[PDB]
Design an enzyme around this catalytic site. Sequence first.
Site, PDB file in Angstrom:
ATOM      1  N   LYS A  99      -9.591   1.734  -0.127  1.00  0.00           N
ATOM      2  CA  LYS A  99      -8.871   1.817  -1.524  1.00  0.00           C
ATOM      3  C   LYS A  99      -9.923   1.454  -2.431  1.00  0.00           C
ATOM      4  CE  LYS A  99      -5.674  -1.384  -2.020  1.00  0.00           C
ATOM      5  NZ  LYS A  99      -5.058  -2.792  -1.666  1.00  0.00           N
TER       6      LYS A  99
ATOM      7  N   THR B 292       0.617   2.431  -6.997  1.00  0.00           N
ATOM      8  CA  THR B 292       1.071   1.972  -7.838  1.00  0.00           C
ATOM      9  C   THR B 292       1.206   1.450  -9.231  1.00  0.00           C
ATOM     10  OG1 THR B 292      -1.284   0.309  -7.176  1.00  0.00           O
ATOM     11  CG2 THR B 292      -0.837  -0.862  -9.172  1.00  0.00           C
TER      12      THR B 292
ATOM     13  N   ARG C 251       4.243  -1.088   4.391  1.00  0.00           N
ATOM     14  CA  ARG C 251       3.119  -2.082   3.107  1.00  0.00           C
ATOM     15  C   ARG C 251       2.456  -3.458   4.027  1.00  0.00           C
ATOM     16  NH1 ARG C 251      -0.761  -2.748  -1.112  1.00  0.00           N
ATOM     17  NH2 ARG C 251       0.938  -3.269  -2.365  1.00  0.00           N
TER      18      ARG C 251
ATOM     19  N   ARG D 235      -9.383 -14.562  -7.879  1.00  0.00           N
ATOM     20  CA  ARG D 235      -8.357 -15.272  -8.427  1.00  0.00           C
ATOM     21  C   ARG D 235      -8.041 -16.999  -9.129  1.00  0.00           C
ATOM     22  NH1 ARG D 235      -4.390 -11.552  -5.987  1.00  0.00           N
ATOM     23  NH2 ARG D 235      -2.755 -12.290  -6.889  1.00  0.00           N
TER      24      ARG D 235
HETATM   25  K   LIG Z   1      -3.872  -6.347  -0.986  1.00  0.00           K
HETATM   26 MG   LIG Z   2      -5.445  -4.130  -6.136  1.00  0.00          MG
END
Ligand SMILES: [K+]
Ligand SMILES: [Mg+2]
Lengths: 505, 504, 505, 406
Positions: free
Chosen positions: B243, B301, B49, B96
């Site tokens: 996702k 995760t 990944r 961010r």
């Molecule tokens: K990402």
């Molecule tokens: Mg994420």
Amino acid sequence: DTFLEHMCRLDIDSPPITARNTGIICTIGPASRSVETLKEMIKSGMNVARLNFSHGTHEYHAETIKNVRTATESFASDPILYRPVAVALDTKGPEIRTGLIKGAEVELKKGATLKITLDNAYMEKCDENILWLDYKNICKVVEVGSKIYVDDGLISLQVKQKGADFLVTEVENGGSLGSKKGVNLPGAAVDLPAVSEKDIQDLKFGVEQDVDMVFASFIRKASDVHEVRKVLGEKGKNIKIISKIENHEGVRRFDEILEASDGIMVARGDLGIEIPAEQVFLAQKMMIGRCNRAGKPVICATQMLESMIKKPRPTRAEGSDVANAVLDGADCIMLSGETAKGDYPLEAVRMQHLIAREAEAAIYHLQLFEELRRLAPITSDPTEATAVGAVEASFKCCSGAIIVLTKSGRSAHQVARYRPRAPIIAVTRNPQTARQAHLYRGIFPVLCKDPVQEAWAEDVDLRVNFAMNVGKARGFFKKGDVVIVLTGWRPGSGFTNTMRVVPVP
Amino acid sequence: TFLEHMCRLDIDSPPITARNTGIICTIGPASRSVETLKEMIKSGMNVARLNFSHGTHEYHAETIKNVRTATESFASDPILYRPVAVALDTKGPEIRTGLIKTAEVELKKGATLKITLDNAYMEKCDENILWLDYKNICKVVEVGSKIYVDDGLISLQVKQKGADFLVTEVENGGSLGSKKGVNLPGAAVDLPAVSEKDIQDLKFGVEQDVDMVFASFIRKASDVHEVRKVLGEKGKNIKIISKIENHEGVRRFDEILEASDGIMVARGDLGIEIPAEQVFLAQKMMIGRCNRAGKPVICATQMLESMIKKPRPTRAEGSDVANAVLDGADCIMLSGETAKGDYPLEAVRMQHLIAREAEAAIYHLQLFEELRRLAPITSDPTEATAVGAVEASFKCCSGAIIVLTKSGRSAHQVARYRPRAPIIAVTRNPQTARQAHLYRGIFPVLCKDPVQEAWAEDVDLRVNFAMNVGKARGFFKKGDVVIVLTGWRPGSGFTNTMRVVPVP
Amino acid sequence: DTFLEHMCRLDIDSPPITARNTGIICTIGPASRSVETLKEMIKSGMNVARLNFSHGTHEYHAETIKNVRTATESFASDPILYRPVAVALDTKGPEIRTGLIKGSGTAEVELKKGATLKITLDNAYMEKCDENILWLDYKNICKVVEVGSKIYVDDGLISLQVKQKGADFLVTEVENGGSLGSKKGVNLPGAAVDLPAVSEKDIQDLKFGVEQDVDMVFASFIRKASDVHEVRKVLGEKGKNIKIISKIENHEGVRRFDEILEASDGIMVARGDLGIEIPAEQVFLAQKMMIGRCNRAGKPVICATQMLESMIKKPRPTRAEGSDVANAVLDGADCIMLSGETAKGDYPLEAVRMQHLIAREAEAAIYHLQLFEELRRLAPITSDPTEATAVGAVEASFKCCSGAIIVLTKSGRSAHQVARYRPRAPIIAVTRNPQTARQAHLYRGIFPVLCKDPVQEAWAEDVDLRVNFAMNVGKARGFFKKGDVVIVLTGWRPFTNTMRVVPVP
Amino acid sequence: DTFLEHMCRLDIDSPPITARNTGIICTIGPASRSVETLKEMIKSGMNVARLNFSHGTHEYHAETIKNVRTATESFASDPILYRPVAVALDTKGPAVSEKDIQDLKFGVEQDVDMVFASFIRKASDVHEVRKVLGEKGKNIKIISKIENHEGVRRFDEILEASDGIMVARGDLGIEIPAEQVFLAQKMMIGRCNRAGKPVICATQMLESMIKKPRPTRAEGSDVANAVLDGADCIMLSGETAKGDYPLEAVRMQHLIAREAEAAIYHLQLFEELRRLAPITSDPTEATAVGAVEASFKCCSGAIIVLTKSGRSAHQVARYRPRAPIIAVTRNPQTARQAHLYRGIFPVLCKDPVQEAWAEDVDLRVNFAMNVGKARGFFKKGDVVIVLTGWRPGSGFTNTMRVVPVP
Ligand SMILES: [K+]
Ligand SMILES: [Mg+2]
Ligand SMILES: [K+]
Ligand SMILES: [K+]
Ligand SMILES: [Mg+2]
Ligand SMILES: [Mg+2]
């Protein structure tokens, strides 16, 4: 998704598939032994013709066999529509019988006295006072107070006195006594042999006449089966032995009998006398279950459409009995007097066809498949694994049929064990395997007569194409439908190791 | 019964060799060298990944080059050669910070922190003022709203609103760094599903011939469609894995699954957007529906999080990986464990160890019965052959299910019914060999031999290849029973033939 | 329908019931031993306080106990809201430890892979451990360990293997390096340890536990039934009512789990040491196995160690940790445990609250009808009216979606038998025995409530008092409101044989 | 375990040792209408007497009823042994004809317990029958007879509006193909078991026994499968009305029925019924299924139920316990109507009402204890389940007790 909810969803207006899976066995007699009537019975749905060797000479039975084969081969001109018909020999076995009436039937009244004699001066002088039978040793296996049943257990006699060659009894249940009626001794241990001298002659006659299967009467234990097997010997090694369970001992020792036998018949007639009538369904459902588990053919028999001997319509109880026999898991259902001597042989066959087909549309198939699977042992057998794979695939694509190319029938037999909804079209070049295939539910045997092709690939396609045409002609499926095809990988093999999922061309 | 199955679980019973669940490894500074990558492939890595939330195209192009260099080092032997897929993880609509002064300032509970949108402070962040790149934050946030920073470790509560600023009180103090992720659980974030940067990253992925894209923050079916459109015709064969990392993603999950090629349960952001207590509910729900649909699902995760600094995982982490496999996850993922951790190799090996022990504990027959029962009745010959093969495999304890496939379709249809036996997928298509790792139990094998004229000879060549593969890797021995799925005759484009055959 | 379909049905927006069923066990230490903090932990959801006797003096633990009881009785003024808090004594047992670092230089030293490390028994090096020489407290270590065998230090993070062998020393080579601190745990998986399960120190600790009136004992390193009997014997007649929870922390304990479970009152899955003795990837197998058998036997089971590790330093748990707690509950654990998270972590309150939240959500994800069906299936047929009443109440609670199951008990026997079948509704157990109230937290779903009212003379009147007390509790605790339905279990005259289904007044 | 494995385990030599749960409904005619005969038929196991009003006059049917009650009350000097016997009126058959209206009002005056309404095509027809009965016979349990295609299709609304269902396979087999009858039977019985309402399988169950002393194998199979399907009652038409062996026919059904329920997978049936059990706030419904659960848990000798309306006894029966349901009651029209439900062996209370209500309950409980100990249900030391009210004059049943037999 539950048995309860499954019953609640059963609906009348949901038509069954056209194919009928459970086999129909018909007893041949005076009402149905002519060539023309036999022809009609075949297109009515007859799969197996039972010849009852309790009566008739070898010349009589040889003639019946010829008529059955004549009627069968009259459809042989078109292999696509040709339906193989099996011939079954039902042995006499250790029967106990009357006894000819004086000569008007005699009336047995309750409380009255009746004497049983072994003196052959009375064998044709039977009446209200005295009675004869053909059991030489009846006066050494019976005690005082014992129960004696005659004529399908419709008449019962309780013993009062015992002698060297006679018995004094009281009429417990009374009715009209006829000539040559069946005698039962439910509590007594019977000295009569399983395979008598007459049975040996009849069995050897069956091998001579090339019968497909033998219905062995009054099988009590495994040794009885082994005797029948030995009599058939080498020459009749391929003849299937169907043990008839009709006594208390038979039900009790069912496990060892099933293992020795090629199949089982639930003979509810005599069983309903040797055993309390209200226990019969227990015996039936038990034997059918263990046979389904073992993967061996089981036959439900006797009085299924009894009232159709005189009536063109069955009773509601009779319609229920046939449907429930199928729902229990019976591979074949049988007709006796309904087809042998009755007034509506054709009607009785067509009715069993209708009910059985409607019954198998009510089968909780996925639950049944699950249960039959968790009992299936794990082996390295390619045929066994292929059969299971074929059945589940047939459920997945709602297959119109499962085509099985087999020489011995084994692959077709193992597909039938898991009870697919779709009919099993078994293509074979072996005439006997085609006839014997009727013993298994869902197997629609078809006989190929084309010469074997050198190139194995197109010899397979030839037989598959034949099964395609059969399915189309008999209305099982059509163009654009999906079918399952089972075959070996190379000729000479004793296994079917290749499964195909192919659209109907 | 399932209870009795649990009671009979034995720690001493050795597991079946060949681990079925895919291992996805995030590549970073600790694992982007050719040397390390080789060891990771040997340790059990199946997919690499690349996270485009960080790094430049030049940086990632070098990483991809290193992956393929390490991968093709085993290419000399196609029998033992293990294909490795390349996954592109999109940045997506991320919020961010915010460059600090690259040190870290301390935030304390009760203190006041001012969030600003003035770009003059985009590189002057401290404990007093904090900059972020969400230009519409003041319009979707209200007074009382909770704002999370750095994986939800730092929490702020909005006290006052301005046109370009927010005055907040620190409710969960901690060390604040640069360029940290921000989550707004209560707010309706209006950032685009596919931004200009995402477009350029996706186009880049096509040029780099990536096998799959992990689309971040997918909220609905149209978001998937946008990603699909950007990939276009040239990248139509690239698998899109959505996702799920927010509430709307879970809410509109069914339509997202339908529009996607697969699903990632992105527990990291998801554990911030919704209460952490609910993540396991979302995970088990999504894996269940993906198993039912026959589409790949990835659990990701913090599965072995402590192994970033320690050579051994915690008891919660060991349990997490095992239960993920038991839930029915096709793939398991490592992030910081392999990206920047001190023990990336140990992390890969640990997941391999736990996964294999876990699939040995699966109630294979009950799971199959449920999948067999939920199976949709269709006229598709391949689907019927697939489930029929899995049935056969259980019936004869098959050593493996060998499938010849061009697109991978037939191999995938076998995988969805969860056979115990490994699936050896023989293909000549290198991409389908790489994408096959997304499905549990599929061991992709890449045939390099040219296509024969004789069709039966071509099939036998590929089948005999798989036979050698299974023997070399210890899946089965000579004389064992295996299942072989192929076509019947040339022309038709479906796998409709099952053979039960001994291993020569 | 099926488990898979149940998984697909799981909804995050579907609120759980207010009541939280699985007990939370908190290890008390410097971060939580104050009266002020203990009150908050009770409010956060603490049910049992674990005192780890691996560290501390008798005076130390006595003060901790005193502090726990002080904080608990601070809520005693309102018996409606009063939550009983149990006190558990966790024994040291056959632990092997280092070994203080030299003191000169830094606190931790660096053991590097391939380096030589000498292990000594010379007490001169007891507080002078370093990179070259290491002291431990196992005096018989040289006589039991073998050349080539492996030694694990500090939660198995460090591994050494014995190369040479001496009288009071072992020469080892570092296999897995790392940072070595003071007094770290040592494991010898492939060795036969001399150390007894109950040492002289353990005996004094156990007797001290009876003196301090502890509710239960967590017996460390239980390997067999005879170890459980030794603990049972030490507690003697005065402590016969103290629950013995056996901690399974090694291979032998897993191997001989059945005889251990039978001799014990409950079980702890001690994953910490267990994850060192056996491969870490096998722990979940042992966990799910032990939980299953405990559920089957109806005995309480505790999942322990590292369930929320990261919360020692961080206010939020990791994703793996959230999953671990949820899955332990789904597995069937009666209690979940916290160690360093509450003992010396920075967020002990947040950790307790997190376990409360996760456990409650997990209970709402339980497939109850499947679980209840299996627990009945594997339930022995008695021959005990108490068993019949418990099962009836549980199923009745399902049929009316009961707000709670109210149980009047004195020993706890009745309430235990109800929890054994895992109802969804909370079990309000009303008792006057304070000890049984505290011990009740070992069972999933039991909310123990202590009745302070004097024993009313008329038995029927005493029942109505305790029952109405449970009503008011359910109301105040928000389990049910006016108009709801609850189940009540009582005796006929002073075992439980009576059940009622009553609307909440 | 599984159903298949259960079939393989069925044993002819495993003697049925319970009572006989499923009811037996006998059509009364010239071969059975005498007091002398009816006494032997009650002894043989008749629980319900059917009167076909397609023939006969009100005068004839009136004389028939008195003989039933005369024969029934001949045992009424011993409440411990007294078998209650219900009376049902089967109409002739526009929901009701002008004759039906007159026949229904007749049944109310004659104090019948049931009404078998013919040709029920819809729920509205059940309304036009309930209307005629009025408040006079509001406790008359209406049993709808499904006789045609429309009755089958619209069965759900009929079942809701009815107190019970009869599968009239006779006329049904004429309307629909005879091979579809078994389908209609199993469907209707399944749904009736689901809704907790009585279902009756009728017509030609022992047809050959009209002229023969023993039944055929098909007939013996039909009765057994009827019980296995889940039928509450089985019926005899011509077998008892004009037959030559009416006594033998009754004793045969009793014999088959008893063997049939000993063959029933007692655990699988309950689990399915319990699984589909509706969630309600009803305390009696919850107590009932709780009692059945407890009964399986301890292999109870019986489940003693104190009822007045019959509901609490019915609710226990809908979940099919293996143990007998001894229903103690005072309303005589309830003890007789209890025969419509499988498993309920009714017992009529003749004792006067005590002032001490606990002693009153303890008397009715002791009554059942005597009954079950004498009819071979349980002995001394056995365990049974007792369902009563809590505090006197309670709205319903809600208390379950498990107590050894004295
Ligand atoms: K990402
Ligand atoms: Mg994420
Ligand atoms: K014969
Ligand atoms: K300890
Ligand atoms: Mg016979
Ligand atoms: Mg420990």
